[PDB]
Design a protein around this ligand. Structure first.
Ligand SMILES: Nc1ncnc2c1ncn2[C@@H]1O[C@H](COS(=O)(=O)NC(=O)c2ccccc2O)[C@@H](O)[C@H]1O
Length: 523
């Protein structure tokens, strides 16, 4: 667990970025401001700030009685829900660090997380993302992967029930210091990202300012709450610390979510592009009343200008583009930015002390507007992954810059434009091709729902291109789309060598497209 050198600590405290409260103290402060206001809602249950705080304290007492102590680690694998929030904040109070596993994670990942972190417990549910994790949890215990397995819901011994632990008398003490690790986030087997209370609260508080969160923010969880976008950018925690209300959802389909928005008067949410595409193309479901919606954050992957330009007309809300990473840096377009920035950039950095360097293969800083590897250090960017000295020696420069693996350029005013991952690059007979440019043209096509362009081996040109396209009916042929690209003025060498009409793309844990999976499919 590498830390910030002393010069940086001192400057981030002097700047006022790092304050002296833990997550638990911060929620308690917010609760005290508005104790009866509804803080969380699910399909039936609604908790006031004061009821949430008390339940968290009661769960904390129960977890302590069950053996969880300050400095312990747990693997937290729960669907979106009230239990996720309660359990997180109870662990924050106790100084117990949760590994924030995603709903899509399975035994390979879960086992690795328990083992690598030496978790005392796995905390899970009777069901998650269509998966029954209780067999796995039994094997975790049988193999020594963790000591204990708590299940919210029904489960057979040797698994233990989480609900009885809420019956304890409320623990009133906090064991967490602002400089301690609060939780382990996960890289997008995922690496463990040690996030500390004071820096990750800076992340939350400043994001909430930039995104205009306030007492009236009604935040819908469009993504897994474990994920950093959903949790802190500004996320669920930004909503709670602004004294807003969080509306939980275990699904992001526009059918369900549009009705929730109407029911709860949702004002804010966050999505990855593929989900935003579904919301933009939702047909009869758009009969819903979405008048309450004020801000749609889109991030995780680039939202091209063809799609971005449809957000305000179709949904009636402002768009914000978010370039983010669990390791640190967040860039945001700002709520008062002109369209040219919101449609065509992925934001500018959150903190004045975020230090960004775009560098070529040699480590040279590129010229302005030129494309290079994004690297960065700053007041909420880690200095290394948890207990990973050998990987850390490659992933961080000697002066402490995190090497993101993304290819970006910068515009005149500091805004980042993401070309994609280093591994997404296409070189077609020595001509370079920016997938995003071709993807954005195809996505503008009226019978194209989404598109993704990747590299395939070729003996003569080294690489050719293949575009995967989800049609909307009536679906165009590959030949019609090649002609449509031509009529748009796309350079000939950039027209995909191959276009695959398909109903869906493989997806990552939170819904991003897996170009790795596509590129392994081709070869
Ligand atoms: N607007 C964008 N345009 C192009 N690419 C983007 C991108 N936003 C992310 N990426 C890619 O996603 C990696 C990080 O992924 S992440 O840890 O899961 N966390 C997130 O995505 C995340 C998103 C929002 C807020 C907090 C977060 O933590 C990045 O290095 C980069 O490759």
């Amino acid at each position: 667990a590498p830390d910030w050198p002393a010069a940086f600590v001192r400057r981030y405290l002097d700047a006022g970025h790092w304050q002296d409260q833990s997550f638990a103290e911060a929620l308690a402060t917010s609760a005290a401001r508005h104790p009866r206001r509804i803080a969380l809602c699910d399909d039936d249950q609604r908790l006031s700030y004061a009821d949430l705080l008390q339940r968290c304290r009661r769960l904390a007492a129960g977890l302590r009685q069950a053996g969880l102590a300050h400095g312990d680690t747990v693997v937290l694998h729960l669907p979106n829900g009230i239990a996720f929030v309660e359990t997180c904040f109870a662990l924050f109070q106790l100084g117990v660090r949760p590994v924030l596993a995603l709903p899509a994670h399975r035994q390979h990942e879960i086992s690795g997380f328990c083992r690598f972190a030496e978790a005392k417990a796995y905390i899970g549910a009777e069901r998650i993302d269509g998966f029954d994790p209780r067999p796995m949890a039994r094997e975790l215990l049988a193999s020594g992967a963790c000591r204990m397995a708590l299940i919210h819901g029904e489960a057979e011994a040797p698994l233990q029930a989480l609900a009885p632990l809420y019956q304890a008398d409320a623990l009133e003490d906090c064991a967490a210091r602002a400089e301690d690790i609060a939780c382990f986030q996960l890289s997008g087997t995922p690496k463990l990202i040690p996030r500390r209370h004071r820096e990750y609260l800076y992340n939350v508080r400043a994001s909430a300012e930039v995104c205009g969160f306030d007492e009236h923010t009604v935040y819908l969880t469009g993504l897994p709450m474990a994920h950093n976008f959903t949790l802190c950018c500004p996320g669920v925690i930004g909503t709670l610390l602004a004294s807003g209300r969080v509306v939980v959802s275990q699904r992001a389909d526009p059918e369900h979510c549009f009705a929730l928005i109407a029911r709860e008067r949702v004002t804010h949410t966050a999505l990855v592009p593929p989900l935003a595409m579904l919301w933009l193309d939702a047909q009869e479901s758009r009969r819903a009343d979405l008048s309450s919606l004020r801000l749609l954050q889109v991030g995780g992957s680039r939202l091209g200008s063809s799609a971005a330009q449809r957000v305000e007309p179709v949904l009636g809300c402002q768009l914000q583009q978010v370039l983010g990473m669990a390791e640190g840096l967040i860039c945001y377009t700002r709520l008062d930015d002109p369209p040219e920035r919101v449609l065509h950039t992925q934001g500018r950095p959150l903190s004045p002390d975020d230090e960004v360097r775009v560098v070529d293969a040699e480590g040279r800083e590129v010229g302005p507007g030129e494309v290079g590897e994004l690297t960065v250090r700053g007041p909420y960017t880690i200095r290394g992954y948890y207990r990973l000295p050998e990987h850390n020696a490659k992933a961080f420069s000697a002066d402490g810059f995190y090497r993101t693996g993304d290819r970006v350029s910068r515009d005149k005013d500091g805004y980042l434009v993401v070309e994609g991952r280093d591994k997404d690059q296409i070189n077609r007979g020595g001509e370079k091709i920016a997938a995003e440019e071709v993807e954005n043209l195809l996505i503008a096509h009226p019978q194209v729902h989404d598109a993704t362009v990747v590299a395939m081996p070729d003996s003569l040109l080294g690489e050719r291109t293949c575009a995967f396209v989800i049609p909307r009916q009536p679906a165009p042929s590959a030949l019609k789309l090649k002609q449509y690209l031509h009529a748009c003025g796309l350079a000939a060498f950039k027209v995909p060598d191959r276009i695959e009409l398909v109903p869906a793309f493989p997806q990552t844990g939170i819904g991003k497209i897996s170009k790795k999976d596509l590129r392994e499919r081709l070869r």
